[PDB]
Design an enzyme around this catalytic site. Structure first.
Site, mmCIF file in Angstrom:
data_model
loop_
_atom_site.group_PDB
_atom_site.id
_atom_site.type_symbol
_atom_site.label_atom_id
_atom_site.label_comp_id
_atom_site.label_asym_id
_atom_site.label_seq_id
_atom_site.Cartn_x
_atom_site.Cartn_y
_atom_site.Cartn_z
ATOM 1 N N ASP A 156 3.400 4.839 5.467
ATOM 2 C CA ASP A 156 2.761 4.026 4.156
ATOM 3 C C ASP A 156 1.752 4.701 3.523
ATOM 4 O O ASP A 156 1.644 6.053 3.462
ATOM 5 C CB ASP A 156 2.496 2.655 4.669
ATOM 6 C CG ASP A 156 2.595 1.540 3.752
ATOM 7 O OD1 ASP A 156 1.803 1.599 2.809
ATOM 8 O OD2 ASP A 156 3.441 0.838 3.773
ATOM 9 N N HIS A 214 -2.315 -1.093 0.996
ATOM 10 C CA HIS A 214 -1.080 -1.473 1.309
ATOM 11 C C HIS A 214 -0.734 -1.208 2.776
ATOM 12 O O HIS A 214 -0.356 -2.057 3.550
ATOM 13 C CB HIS A 214 0.088 -1.120 0.320
ATOM 14 C CG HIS A 214 1.214 -1.566 0.652
ATOM 15 N ND1 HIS A 214 2.265 -0.797 1.516
ATOM 16 C CD2 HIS A 214 2.117 -2.556 0.127
ATOM 17 C CE1 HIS A 214 3.351 -1.399 1.611
ATOM 18 N NE2 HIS A 214 3.356 -2.388 0.582
ATOM 19 N N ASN A 259 11.917 -6.106 -3.139
ATOM 20 C CA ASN A 259 11.425 -7.257 -3.665
ATOM 21 C C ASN A 259 11.957 -7.456 -5.099
ATOM 22 O O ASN A 259 11.328 -7.991 -6.091
ATOM 23 C CB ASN A 259 10.093 -6.976 -3.820
ATOM 24 C CG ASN A 259 9.114 -6.859 -2.675
ATOM 25 O OD1 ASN A 259 9.429 -7.362 -1.426
ATOM 26 N ND2 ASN A 259 8.204 -6.129 -2.582
ATOM 27 N N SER A 293 7.383 -5.969 2.148
ATOM 28 C CA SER A 293 6.247 -5.169 2.809
ATOM 29 C C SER A 293 5.367 -5.849 3.882
ATOM 30 O O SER A 293 4.927 -5.281 5.062
ATOM 31 C CB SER A 293 5.460 -4.539 1.767
ATOM 32 O OG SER A 293 5.904 -3.467 1.211
#
Length: 279
Positions: free
Chosen positions: A39, A69, A161, A224
């Site tokens: 990530d 994130h 998403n 996520s």
């Protein structure tokens, strides 16, 4: 063990019903397992990680998470308050820049890095990788995820998403990894969650409280956020000896809460991750 006033997603993964707020789990808590968070990095100094998180690789000028994130996702895997597997070891691999973006070539290199790097770590209960990232379909990206899984790592990836069929996104569309959709606190499919036959499981993904950079916390939404619930659950179940990296996605689907989510399109699994912990 019981954690009172837990984030709703933790309570959900140990419950046969929505609407409760205590997380119940075996005290082994993923001890002896390892989860790689591929990530934007992890703020390992966050008190919530208790010294159990470390950066092991970056492709950029720093290994620090300048976005948040990756720290949020790592917190859902394994932070003391916000995490599923509260005693796992967390390893950060920074394939995304501080804007949250990354080239597929870098992402592929990061996956192959984890497949090798696990041989440099002590993970007697097994190894998991959490990939809260993706883009358009790429056979090379899918193949890298398949290699990582084949090497003996439980790979959990975000469905995406786009409120669309995940067959058109990678690594979501790779059949051999665990593709994770998102749900909300009322057991509805999250409004943005991708769907389709390639999904293996749903996890909590709307309004998820976890760690953030600057030693903080915040609530955000996405597939996520669902993915690290499943990655942490895998690590927890592997520590218990109930499953292995190669079989954990199937085991999670076998033991999921079934038929309880609303707005699941015909042809998408109606399965919600569940730890089946009996206190």
């Amino acid at each position: 063990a019981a954690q009172t006033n837990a984030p709703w997603g933790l309570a959900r993964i140990s419950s046969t019903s929505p609407g409760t707020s205590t997380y119940y789990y075996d005290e082994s808590a993923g001890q002896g397992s390892c989860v790689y968070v591929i990530d934007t990095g992890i703020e390992a100094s966050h008190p919530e990680f208790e010294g159990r998180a470390q950066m092991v690789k970056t492709y950029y000028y720093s290994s620090r998470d300048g976005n948040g994130h990756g720290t949020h996702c790592a917190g859902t895997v394994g932070s003391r308050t916000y995490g599923v597997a509260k005693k796992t070891q967390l390893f950060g691999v920074k394939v995304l820049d501080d804007n949250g973006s990354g080239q597929y070539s870098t992402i592929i290199a990061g996956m192959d890095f984890v497949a090798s790097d696990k041989n440099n770590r002590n993970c007697p209960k097994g190894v998991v990788a959490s990939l809260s990232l993706g883009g358009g379909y790429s056979s090379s990206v899918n193949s890298a995820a398949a290699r990582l899984q084949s090497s003996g790592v439980m790979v959990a990836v975000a469905a995406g998403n786009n409120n669309a069929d995940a067959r058109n996104y990678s690594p979501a569309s790779e059949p051999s990894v665990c593709t994770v959709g998102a749900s909300d606190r009322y057991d509805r499919r999250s409004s943005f969650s991708n769907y389709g036959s390639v999904l293996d499981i749903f996890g909590p993904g709307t309004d998820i409280l976890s760690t953030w950079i600057g030693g903080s916390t915040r609530s955000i939404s996405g597939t996520s956020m669902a993915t690290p619930h499943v990655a942490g659950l895998a690590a927890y179940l592997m520590t218990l000896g109930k499953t292995t990296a190669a079989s954990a996605c199937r085991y999670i689907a076998d033991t999921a809460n079934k038929g309880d989510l609303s707005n699941i399109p015909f042809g998408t699994v109606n399965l919600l991750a569940y730890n089946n912990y009996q206190a």
